Amino acid sequence: MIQTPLLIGFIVMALASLAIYIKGAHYGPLLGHTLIHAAVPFIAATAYLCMYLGVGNLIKVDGSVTYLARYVDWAFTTPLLLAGVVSSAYYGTRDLYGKSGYITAIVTLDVIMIVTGLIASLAPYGVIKWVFFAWSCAAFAGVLYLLWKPVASIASQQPGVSPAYRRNVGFLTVLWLIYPVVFAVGPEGFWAVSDATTVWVFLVLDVLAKVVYAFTSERNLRAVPV
Ligand SMILES: CCCCCCCC/C=C/CCCCCCCC(=O)OC[C@@H](O)CO
Ligand SMILES: CCCCCCCC/C=C/CCCCCCCC(=O)OC[C@H](O)CO
Ligand SMILES: CCCCCCCC/C=C/CCCCCCCC(=O)OC[C@H](O)CO
Ligand SMILES: CCCCCCCC/C=C/CCCCCCCC(=O)OC[C@H](O)CO
Ligand SMILES: CCCCCCCC/C=C\CCCCCCCC(=O)OC[C@H](O)CO
Ligand SMILES: *C/C=C(C)/C=C/C=C(C)/C=C/C1=C(C)CCCC1(C)C
């Protein structure tokens, strides 16, 4: 039942929240890295605690379920993750411009992606639901474009962080593209798959996006001399 994956996430995210803070490197730019990558699983563990106990679980007239705790989790964890990716490109340089601006612009596009994704879930099957789905994907495209074109240009102007940035962005892009696919196939969208199947896939996605990525992103940046 759905109660099992929610508890699994709560224990995995809470334990990983401390495990990342303990094992995470506290050297220079990596200090704020593990600090942000320790808050992300702590926010997720709190959300899985809410879903497990029913805080925010909205049920519509057609039987669809909207997890308000999940989207608030995404609304704050995904901007913190992008904040660390954009900041990692500015690592080791005090002479480059746009750090505060790029983070601000990409967080705006990410929050709109998550908020409009919440409106789509709440909407019934129709035009209103899929219009905000396409507008959410449009904002997602702007996050990816910004990540790939502009801030990789900032990383490339100094090695060897540039290959470490490109490897972390490639992992994040493939991982985050799975999320809207689960939305469409699950009850929130087309309802091709059951609600419990979406909970299980989002569990493995979140563990990959918040626990596993936190350790591979650190390993890549660890090699660069900054
Ligand atoms: C790196 C890209 C991402 C890779 C991983 C992507 C897939 C992650 C998913 C993991 C498990 C998916 C399958 C989960 C299947 C769950 C089915 C289930 O609980 O059924 C309940 C009732 O319907 C029974 O009647
Ligand atoms: C390197 C680390 C990688 C970590 C990430 C890879 C994880 C692999 C997949 C696991 C998910 C398994 C999903 C199982 C879905 C069915 C579960 C089920 O039916 O549970 C029993 C039920 O609760 C009682 O009736
Ligand atoms: C330099 C600036 C740094 C700023 C750092 C960012 C702020 C961190 C915020 C975390 C919020 C965590 C919220 C966790 C929400 C869990 C789910 C929940 O509360 O759901 C309620 C439900 O919707 C009722 O029906
Ligand atoms: C780096 C940190 C970045 C932090 C960024 C934080 C952004 C928070 C988003 C706010 C959207 C608020 C409005 C969301 C839309 C309303 C959804 C809602 O509350 O729905 C209730 C439901 O319909 C009842 O039945
Ligand atoms: C650039 C931003 C990201 C862009 C990429 C993300 C959007 C993906 C969209 C569709 C995926 C396809 C989903 C396929 C769902 C099939 C549903 C189906 O066949 O439903 C049958 C029926 O509903 C039985 O009840
Ligand atoms: C740790 C949790 C993560 C990384 C969650 C990510 C979620 C998304 C990238 C969701 C994207 C969506 C769209 C682009 C369109 C449909 C609505 C969403 C919110 C599922």
Coordinates of C-alpha atoms and ligand atoms in Angstrom, one line a residue:
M1 CA 0.0 0.0 0.0
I2 CA 1.0 3.7 -0.4
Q3 CA 1.8 3.8 3.3
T4 CA 5.0 1.7 2.7
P5 CA 6.9 3.9 0.2
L6 CA 6.1 7.1 2.2
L7 CA 7.7 5.7 5.3
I8 CA 10.6 4.3 3.3
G9 CA 11.2 7.8 1.9
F10 CA 10.9 9.4 5.4
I11 CA 13.6 7.1 6.9
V12 CA 15.8 7.3 3.8
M13 CA 15.6 11.1 3.5
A14 CA 16.0 11.8 7.2
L15 CA 19.0 9.4 7.5
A16 CA 20.6 10.8 4.3
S17 CA 20.1 14.3 5.6
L18 CA 22.5 13.5 8.4
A19 CA 24.7 11.2 6.3
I20 CA 25.4 13.9 3.7
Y21 CA 26.2 16.5 6.4
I22 CA 28.6 14.1 8.2
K23 CA 30.4 12.6 5.2
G24 CA 30.1 15.8 3.1
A25 CA 33.3 17.8 2.6
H26 CA 33.5 21.1 4.5
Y27 CA 36.3 22.6 2.4
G28 CA 35.8 26.0 0.9
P29 CA 33.1 26.1 -1.8
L30 CA 32.1 22.5 -0.9
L31 CA 31.1 23.7 2.6
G32 CA 28.0 25.5 1.3
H33 CA 27.5 22.6 -1.1
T34 CA 27.0 19.9 1.5
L35 CA 25.1 22.4 3.6
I36 CA 22.5 22.8 0.8
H37 CA 22.6 19.1 0.0
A38 CA 21.8 18.4 3.7
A39 CA 18.8 20.7 3.8
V40 CA 17.3 19.1 0.6
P41 CA 16.7 15.6 2.1
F42 CA 15.6 17.2 5.4
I43 CA 12.8 19.0 3.5
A44 CA 11.9 15.9 1.6
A45 CA 11.9 13.8 4.8
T46 CA 9.4 16.3 6.3
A47 CA 7.2 16.0 3.2
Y48 CA 7.2 12.2 3.3
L49 CA 6.3 12.5 6.9
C50 CA 3.2 14.6 5.9
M51 CA 2.2 12.3 3.1
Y52 CA 2.6 9.2 5.3
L53 CA 0.2 10.7 7.9
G54 CA -2.2 12.4 5.5
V55 CA -1.1 16.1 5.9
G56 CA -2.0 17.6 2.5
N57 CA -3.4 14.5 0.8
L58 CA -6.3 16.0 -1.2
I59 CA -8.8 13.7 -2.9
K60 CA -10.9 14.9 -5.8
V61 CA -14.4 13.9 -6.9
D62 CA -13.0 11.6 -9.6
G63 CA -10.7 9.7 -7.1
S64 CA -7.5 11.5 -8.1
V65 CA -5.1 12.3 -5.3
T66 CA -3.0 15.5 -5.1
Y67 CA -0.1 15.4 -2.6
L68 CA 0.3 19.0 -1.4
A69 CA 3.3 17.9 0.7
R70 CA 5.1 16.6 -2.5
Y71 CA 4.8 19.9 -4.4
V72 CA 5.8 22.1 -1.5
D73 CA 8.8 19.7 -1.2
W74 CA 9.6 20.3 -4.9
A75 CA 8.9 24.0 -4.6
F76 CA 11.8 24.5 -2.2
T77 CA 14.2 21.6 -2.9
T78 CA 14.5 22.2 -6.6
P79 CA 15.5 25.9 -6.2
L80 CA 18.1 24.9 -3.7
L81 CA 19.5 22.2 -6.1
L82 CA 19.7 24.7 -9.0
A83 CA 21.2 27.3 -6.6
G84 CA 24.1 24.9 -6.0
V85 CA 24.6 24.0 -9.7
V86 CA 24.7 27.7 -10.8
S87 CA 27.0 28.5 -7.8
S88 CA 29.3 25.6 -8.7
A89 CA 30.0 27.3 -12.1
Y90 CA 31.1 30.5 -10.3
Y91 CA 33.4 28.5 -8.0
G92 CA 36.9 29.9 -7.6
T93 CA 36.2 33.2 -9.4
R94 CA 35.4 36.6 -7.8
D95 CA 35.8 38.4 -11.2
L96 CA 32.8 36.9 -13.0
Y97 CA 29.4 38.6 -13.1
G98 CA 25.8 37.3 -13.0
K99 CA 25.8 34.8 -10.1
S100 CA 23.0 36.5 -8.1
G101 CA 21.1 37.2 -11.3
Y102 CA 21.3 33.7 -12.9
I103 CA 20.2 32.0 -9.7
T104 CA 17.4 34.4 -9.3
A105 CA 16.2 33.9 -12.9
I106 CA 16.4 30.1 -12.8
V107 CA 14.6 29.9 -9.4
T108 CA 11.7 32.0 -10.8
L109 CA 11.3 29.5 -13.7
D110 CA 11.6 26.5 -11.4
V111 CA 9.0 27.7 -8.9
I112 CA 6.6 28.5 -11.8
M113 CA 7.2 25.0 -13.2
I114 CA 6.3 23.5 -9.8
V115 CA 3.4 25.8 -9.1
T116 CA 1.8 25.4 -12.5
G117 CA 2.4 21.7 -12.1
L118 CA 0.4 21.9 -8.9
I119 CA -2.5 23.7 -10.8
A120 CA -2.5 20.9 -13.4
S121 CA -2.8 18.2 -10.8
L122 CA -5.7 20.0 -9.1
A123 CA -7.4 20.6 -12.4
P124 CA -9.7 17.9 -13.9
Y125 CA -8.9 16.2 -17.1
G126 CA -9.4 18.8 -19.8
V127 CA -7.9 21.9 -21.4
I128 CA -7.1 23.7 -18.1
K129 CA -5.0 20.7 -16.9
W130 CA -2.9 20.3 -20.0
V131 CA -2.5 24.1 -20.7
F132 CA -0.5 24.5 -17.4
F133 CA 1.3 21.3 -18.2
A134 CA 2.7 22.8 -21.4
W135 CA 3.4 26.1 -19.6
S136 CA 5.2 24.1 -16.9
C137 CA 7.3 22.4 -19.6
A138 CA 8.0 25.8 -21.2
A139 CA 9.4 27.0 -17.8
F140 CA 11.3 23.6 -17.6
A141 CA 12.8 24.3 -21.0
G142 CA 14.0 27.7 -19.8
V143 CA 15.6 26.1 -16.8
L144 CA 17.4 23.6 -19.0
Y145 CA 18.4 26.3 -21.6
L146 CA 19.8 28.6 -18.9
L147 CA 21.6 25.7 -17.3
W148 CA 23.1 24.4 -20.5
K149 CA 23.8 27.5 -22.6
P150 CA 24.5 30.6 -20.4
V151 CA 26.0 29.2 -17.1
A152 CA 28.1 26.5 -18.9
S153 CA 29.6 29.4 -20.8
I154 CA 30.5 30.8 -17.4
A155 CA 32.0 27.4 -16.3
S156 CA 33.9 26.9 -19.6
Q157 CA 35.8 30.2 -19.1
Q158 CA 37.9 28.5 -16.4
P159 CA 39.0 24.8 -16.0
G160 CA 38.8 22.3 -14.7
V161 CA 35.4 23.0 -13.1
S162 CA 33.9 23.1 -16.6
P163 CA 34.0 19.2 -17.1
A164 CA 32.7 18.7 -13.6
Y165 CA 29.8 21.1 -14.3
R166 CA 28.9 19.4 -17.6
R167 CA 28.8 16.0 -15.9
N168 CA 26.5 17.1 -13.1
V169 CA 24.1 18.9 -15.4
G170 CA 23.8 15.9 -17.6
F171 CA 22.9 13.7 -14.6
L172 CA 20.4 16.3 -13.4
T173 CA 18.8 16.8 -16.8
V174 CA 18.1 13.1 -17.5
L175 CA 16.9 12.6 -13.9
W176 CA 14.5 15.6 -13.9
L177 CA 13.0 14.7 -17.3
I178 CA 11.6 11.5 -15.7
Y179 CA 9.4 13.6 -13.3
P180 CA 6.9 15.0 -15.9
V181 CA 6.7 11.6 -17.6
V182 CA 5.4 10.1 -14.3
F183 CA 3.0 13.0 -13.9
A184 CA 1.4 12.3 -17.3
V185 CA 1.1 8.5 -17.0
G186 CA -0.1 8.7 -13.4
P187 CA -3.6 9.7 -12.1
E188 CA -2.5 13.3 -12.1
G189 CA -2.4 13.3 -15.9
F190 CA -3.6 10.5 -18.2
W191 CA -4.2 8.0 -15.3
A192 CA -2.5 5.2 -17.3
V193 CA -0.8 4.0 -14.1
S194 CA -2.1 3.7 -10.6
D195 CA -1.4 6.2 -7.8
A196 CA 0.7 3.7 -5.8
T197 CA 3.0 3.2 -8.9
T198 CA 3.6 7.0 -9.0
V199 CA 4.5 7.0 -5.3
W200 CA 7.1 4.2 -5.9
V201 CA 8.7 5.8 -9.0
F202 CA 8.9 9.2 -7.3
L203 CA 10.5 7.5 -4.3
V204 CA 13.3 6.1 -6.5
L205 CA 13.5 9.4 -8.4
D206 CA 13.8 11.5 -5.2
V207 CA 16.5 9.2 -3.8
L208 CA 18.4 9.6 -7.0
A209 CA 17.8 13.4 -7.1
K210 CA 18.5 14.1 -3.4
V211 CA 20.7 11.3 -2.0
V212 CA 22.6 9.8 -4.9
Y213 CA 23.1 13.0 -6.8
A214 CA 24.4 14.7 -3.6
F215 CA 27.3 12.3 -3.5
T216 CA 28.1 12.2 -7.2
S217 CA 27.9 16.0 -7.6
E218 CA 30.4 16.3 -4.7
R219 CA 32.7 13.7 -6.2
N220 CA 32.9 15.6 -9.5
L221 CA 33.6 18.9 -7.8
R222 CA 36.0 17.3 -5.4
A223 CA 38.4 16.5 -8.2
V224 CA 38.6 20.1 -9.5
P225 CA 41.1 22.2 -7.5
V226 CA 38.4 24.4 -6.1
Ligands
LIG1 C1 18.2 7.6 -14.1 C2 16.8 7.7 -14.6 C3 15.8 7.0 -13.6 C4 15.9 5.5 -13.5 C5 14.9 4.9 -12.6 C6 13.5 5.1 -13.1 C7 12.4 4.1 -12.6 C8 12.3 4.1 -11.1 C9 11.2 3.2 -10.6 C10 11.3 2.2 -9.7 C11 10.2 1.2 -9.5 C12 9.1 1.4 -10.5 C13 8.0 0.3 -10.4 C14 7.0 0.4 -9.3 C15 5.8 -0.5 -9.4 C16 4.9 -0.4 -8.2 C17 3.6 -1.1 -8.5 C18 2.7 -1.2 -7.3 O1 3.0 -0.9 -6.2 O2 1.5 -1.6 -7.6 C19 0.4 -1.5 -6.6 C20 -0.9 -2.0 -7.1 O3 -1.1 -1.4 -8.4 C21 -0.9 -3.5 -7.2 O4 -2.2 -3.9 -7.7
LIG2 C1 22.9 2.9 -6.5 C2 21.6 3.1 -5.7 C3 20.4 3.1 -6.5 C4 19.1 3.4 -5.7 C5 17.9 3.5 -6.6 C6 17.5 2.2 -7.3 C7 16.4 1.4 -6.7 C8 16.0 0.2 -7.5 C9 14.5 0.0 -7.4 C10 13.8 -0.1 -6.3 C11 12.3 0.2 -6.2 C12 11.5 -1.0 -6.1 C13 10.0 -0.7 -6.3 C14 9.1 -1.8 -6.0 C15 7.6 -1.6 -6.4 C16 6.6 -2.5 -5.8 C17 6.6 -2.5 -4.3 C18 5.5 -3.3 -3.7 O1 4.6 -3.8 -4.3 O2 5.6 -3.2 -2.4 C19 5.0 -4.3 -1.6 C20 3.6 -3.9 -1.1 O3 3.8 -2.7 -0.4 C21 2.9 -5.0 -0.3 O4 1.7 -5.4 -0.9
LIG3 C1 19.7 32.4 1.7 C2 18.3 32.0 1.7 C3 18.0 30.6 2.1 C4 16.6 30.2 2.0 C5 16.3 28.7 2.1 C6 15.0 28.2 1.5 C7 13.9 28.2 2.5 C8 13.7 26.8 3.2 C9 12.2 26.4 3.4 C10 11.8 25.3 3.7 C11 10.3 24.9 3.7 C12 10.0 23.5 4.0 C13 8.5 23.2 3.8 C14 8.1 21.7 4.0 C15 6.7 21.4 3.6 C16 6.2 20.0 3.9 C17 4.8 19.8 3.4 C18 3.8 20.6 4.1 O1 4.0 21.4 5.0 O2 2.6 20.5 3.6 C19 1.5 21.1 4.2 C20 0.2 20.8 3.6 O3 0.2 21.3 2.2 C21 -1.0 21.2 4.3 O4 -2.2 20.7 3.7
LIG4 C1 15.7 29.4 -2.9 C2 14.3 29.4 -2.3 C3 13.2 29.6 -3.2 C4 11.8 29.7 -2.5 C5 10.7 29.8 -3.5 C6 9.3 29.6 -2.8 C7 8.1 29.7 -3.7 C8 6.8 29.3 -3.0 C9 5.6 29.3 -3.9 C10 4.5 29.9 -3.8 C11 3.3 29.7 -4.6 C12 2.0 30.0 -3.8 C13 0.7 29.7 -4.6 C14 0.6 28.3 -5.1 C15 -0.7 28.0 -5.8 C16 -1.9 27.7 -4.9 C17 -2.0 26.2 -4.5 C18 -2.8 25.9 -3.3 O1 -2.6 26.4 -2.2 O2 -3.8 25.1 -3.5 C19 -4.7 24.9 -2.4 C20 -5.8 23.9 -2.7 O3 -6.3 24.3 -4.0 C21 -6.9 23.8 -1.7 O4 -8.0 23.0 -2.2
LIG5 C1 11.1 20.2 -22.0 C2 10.2 19.9 -20.8 C3 9.9 18.4 -20.7 C4 9.2 17.7 -21.8 C5 9.0 16.3 -21.6 C6 7.9 16.0 -20.6 C7 6.5 15.9 -21.1 C8 6.2 14.5 -21.6 C9 4.8 14.4 -22.1 C10 4.2 13.2 -22.4 C11 4.8 11.9 -22.1 C12 4.1 10.7 -22.6 C13 3.1 10.1 -21.6 C14 2.3 8.9 -22.1 C15 1.0 8.6 -21.4 C16 0.1 7.7 -22.1 C17 -1.2 7.7 -21.5 C18 -2.2 6.7 -22.1 O1 -1.9 5.9 -23.0 O2 -3.4 6.7 -21.5 C19 -4.3 5.6 -21.8 C20 -5.5 5.8 -21.0 O3 -5.4 7.0 -20.2 C21 -5.8 4.6 -20.1 O4 -6.8 5.0 -19.1
LIG6 C1 13.7 16.2 -5.4 C2 12.6 16.4 -6.2 C3 12.6 16.8 -7.6 C4 13.9 16.9 -8.3 C5 11.4 17.1 -8.3 C6 11.3 17.5 -9.6 C7 10.1 17.7 -10.3 C8 9.9 18.2 -11.6 C9 11.1 18.6 -12.4 C10 8.6 18.4 -12.1 C11 8.3 18.9 -13.4 C12 7.0 19.0 -13.9 C13 6.9 19.4 -15.2 C14 8.0 20.0 -16.0 C15 5.6 19.4 -16.0 C16 4.4 18.7 -15.3 C17 4.4 19.1 -13.9 C18 5.7 18.8 -13.1 C19 5.7 19.6 -11.8 C20 5.6 17.3 -12.7

